[PDB]
Symmetry: C2
Subunit: 360 residues, 2 copies
């Protein structure tokens, strides 16, 4: 046991009194698969919503075909930007782009923008140095990226480079502005992944704050704000404490000038902490459910962090603590996003539970 529905639903979880702080394991494992199919094409969230899809949690590809209308942007994690040599750039991973899948998700979800993640990988201090320094090389980099976008039918890219350098920026901001301009000239979208303004556990600003935002926000289309992964293996706790999330937006755009360009980050995966071993593992839907069945734990609602956690004990490992999103933790953050005037980005659409989408 315990009973697991498999049929769809007439009404979405919000109209079934399912989004509650008083949660029972049985309620989750019983309803998770039962999403409202009849309204799988309706949007209950008004802002933009970006969804990431990865090849290693392929359930995401299917989720996207079923719930695509609930998304404004879908970003597949396939590509990397490599600098092979002076004025020589190469987009790798193209062997994973699935044209048939793209044709499918676009068929039943017009307006859906497919903006693949472009990760700067294997770059060195000098790569950035020689590149951020030459307008020529920047232009070459732009030609490369725009080409794979037009040849592979991508609506643009979600660039991930900012903390993926860690030197510190007038020069980085410069090649991002240029790239975005080149992209825009080709009728393509330009988004940027960015770290939370307030660094977890420190009460201090991080590498991407209002100084940077002010300069890029006018030119870029969106910002995938990582507002998740707040706790660590050594210091177990919530994924994204509600008020930290709220502050991370306020501190980044206090005067509310580009709120709709901010995609507030949400995690669909959870973390399973080994309290004694000072270690942790990420947990996706399949595991989460299995865990609830295996231990039938008591779900506790941390009203301050606004998340549910539960404890269980393994004979070998010891005592564990799990923080995985629930309908309550999600709805609460979608309301925050609503109130903050911001959008939402979900990492990723192969890690959560099917009835989550009823909320989007």
């Amino acid at each position: 046991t315990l009973l697991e529905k498999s049929q769809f639903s007439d009404k979405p979880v919000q109209d079934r009194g399912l989004v509650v702080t008083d949660l029972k394991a049985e309620s989750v494992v019983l309803e998770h698969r039962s999403y409202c199919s009849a309204k799988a094409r309706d949007r209950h969230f008004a802002g933009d919503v970006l969804g990431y899809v990865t090849p290693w949690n392929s359930h995401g590809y299917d989720v996207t075909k079923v719930f695509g209308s609930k998304f404004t942007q879908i970003s597949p994690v396939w590509l990397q930007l490599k600098r092979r040599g002076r004025e020589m750039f190469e987009v790798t991973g193209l062997h994973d782009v699935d044209q048939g899948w793209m044709r499918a998700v676009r068929k039943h979800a017009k307006g859906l923008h497919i903006v693949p993640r472009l990760l700067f990988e294997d770059w060195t201090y000098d790569d950035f140095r020689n590149v951020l320094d030459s307008e020529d090389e920047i232009e070459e980099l732009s030609k490369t990226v725009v080409q794979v976008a037009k040849n592979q039918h991508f609506d643009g890219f979600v660039v991930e480079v900012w903390n993926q350098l860690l030197s510190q920026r007038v020069g980085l901001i410069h090649m991002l502005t240029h790239l975005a301009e080149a992209l825009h000239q080709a009728r393509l979208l330009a988004l940027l992944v960015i770290p939370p303004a307030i660094t977890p556990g420190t009460d201090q600003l991080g590498m991407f704050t209002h100084k940077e935002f002010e300069q890029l926000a006018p030119v870029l289309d969106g910002f995938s704000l990582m507002t998740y992964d707040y706790s660590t293996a050594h210091q177990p706790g919530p994924n994204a404490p509600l008020s930290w999330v709220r502050a991370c937006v306020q501190v980044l755009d206090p005067k509310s000038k580009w709120r709709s360009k901010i995609l507030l980050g949400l995690n669909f995966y959870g973390m399973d902490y080994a309290t004694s071993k000072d270690a942790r593992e990420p947990v996706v839907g399949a595991r989460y459910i299995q865990t609830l069945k295996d231990h039938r734990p008591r779900m506790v609602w941390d009203s301050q962090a606004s998340e549910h956690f539960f404890e269980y004990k393994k004979s070998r490992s010891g005592r564990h603590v799990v923080f995985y999103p629930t309908l309550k933790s999600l709805q609460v953050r979608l309301e925050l996003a609503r109130e903050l005037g911001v959008g939402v980005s979900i990492w990723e659409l192969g890690q959560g539970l099917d009835y989550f989408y009823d909320l989007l």
Copy 2:
């Protein structure tokens, strides 16, 4: 056994190589009393500095006399504002205002503004509800306050009531603006004490943010920012980590419209922690120096917080950790205020080491 200077120097500390990161306890006990009497009236900081003086640390009265020139405002902690009844207000503590002392400091430090602190004391929720809701009540409170400033030769006040309420928060702003307006009609200054934008160990914003600063900055003459007392007895640590101090200023005045009106707070007292007993006691200069003599501890530089700490054992009580300001932790914060374009408020002139003022 330890050599302790007693005479003044020809040059200030910043020109005697005393502002260092690699500190030795004995160097501090040797140079603390020795300030540059010559340049005691020379300003090495160019933003406004506000100094507090309390009756219980009377050393501040003499400190103000000798170094009054390095200050723009001096705020004697003598007054409280009380609601005795409907439209009946009163300023208590007037028995502590020393007119001779004021005349003395203004003799050697002309153009120095004495702005006594006016602490709202014994106010009830109903007092606040009755006053913030009545335009008449506010007019009376205002007249009561302006009258003593005039009768006692005050240049204005540094009012402290913000943390006392904050649940209407907007009515508190109307009343401070009406008071500020009345004080200006009488040529008096109006400063407000405010909590840090980012609450220590919380990673989220506090009760006084840029939303409040936007509305009060135009009508108020200054803001005494409490950017100190970061750690707690259960979590011993630095007074005010440098980056937390910077973040509180940046988050408060992002676009930089009124930096000059921000008085970045600096602590001149330190905290002595009982590692195991979850306790602590504030430490003033006399006690700090005595401790260095009694244990001659190794001084460690916390490059992350930009502060010096040292430890010592006492079988009687237990292991201890002390966090007290040094020329270095101070100088680094003056350069920070300098680069943020803000001023500085010191709590309080009775708790430091004489040679600190060399820095300004």
